[PDB]
Amino acid sequence: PQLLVLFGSQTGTAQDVSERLGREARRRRLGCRVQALDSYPVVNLINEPLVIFVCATTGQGDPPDNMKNFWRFIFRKNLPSTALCQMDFAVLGLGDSSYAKFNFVAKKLHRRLLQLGGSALLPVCLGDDQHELGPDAAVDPWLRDLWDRVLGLYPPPP
Ligand SMILES: Cc1cc2nc3c(=O)[nH]c(=O)nc-3n(C[C@H](O)[C@H](O)[C@H](O)COP(=O)(O)O)c2cc1C
């Protein structure tokens, strides 16, 4: 048992958060791969049982450069609604409440993965630079919730 963490990051925050998830996976003795969305072979997703998507929202509500090819792929009109039936996922958004399109990338991605038959483990995380503590205000409790759900998927020895 294994976790895949895929990110879309323009200025490094969503990547750093993904690096943190990798550290937290290691502490929980779970195998973990961390990779940018445009570099992961997206066809392999219909085979992944557990994927966290960590996605920033950039200028004008657009996806970061390193998830653009992924975005084009995942929103293909005729992908079967059944494509991701084997997948448990969660989407961790990084954004800023100042903007009109607050965490639009993560919100849209969550909805799309549901459309493709994925099972969400958690609501989308609304990481928000506007918070006094930055995105960690939303990320910390969300990650706590995620690990509780993940250890439901992958129980201890007894
Ligand atoms: C030029 C620029 C445009 C941004 N536009 C948005 C936006 O439209 N919506 C939003 O929620 N956040 C927006 N943000 C906030 C970022 O999503 C936030 O800083 C995030 O933590 C950056 O993650 P990254 O470093 O992984 O790209 C913007 C930030 C910058 C610097």
Side-chain angles (χ1 to χ4, degrees):
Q2 145 271 238
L3 165 72
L4 182 60
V5 179
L6 300 178
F7 67 84
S9 180
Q10 195 58 26
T11 64
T13 316
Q15 186 185 305
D16 186 75
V17 170
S18 296
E19 294 180 33
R20 172 184 170 178
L21 274 158
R23 284 193 304 277
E24 290 181 7
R26 180 167 178 236
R27 288 187 201 96
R28 286 162 180 81
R29 294 142 174 285
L30 293 164
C32 183
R33 291 174 65 102
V34 178
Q35 189 171 31
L37 276 155
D38 279 5
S39 302
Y40 178 83
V42 70
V43 82
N44 209 77
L45 278 186
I46 87 104
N47 275 339
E48 293 282 5
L50 179 60
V51 187
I52 313 305
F53 291 88
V54 184
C55 300
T57 295
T58 200
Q60 301 80 47
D62 292 330
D65 291 340
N66 66 9
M67 66 173 292
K68 276 176 158 62
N69 286 339
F70 170 80
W71 202 242
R72 164 154 19 80
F73 175 89
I74 199 75
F75 284 105
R76 179 192 187 89
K77 187 166 67 172
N78 64 353
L79 293 181
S81 67
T82 263
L84 269 27
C85 280
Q86 200 154 247
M87 189 195 279
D88 291 310
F89 73 88
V91 183
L92 195 174
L94 294 179
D96 178 325
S97 268
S98 268
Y99 293 87
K101 294 186 181 212
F102 175 51
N103 266 305
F104 265 35
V105 175
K107 286 170 174 183
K108 290 178 184 177
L109 180 60
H110 184 275
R111 170 170 172 273
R112 181 55 176 167
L113 298 167
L114 288 179
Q115 286 182 341
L116 302 175
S119 299
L121 294 157
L122 299 176
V124 42
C125 188
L126 300 171
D128 186 6
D129 281 353
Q130 214 55 34
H131 201 280
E132 278 77 14
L133 267 25
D136 276 20
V139 174
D140 288 348
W142 193 90
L143 254 19
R144 252 124 30 186
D145 286 349
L146 179 65
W147 291 122
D148 290 340
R149 185 58 220 273
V150 172
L151 296 191
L153 279 159
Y154 301 131

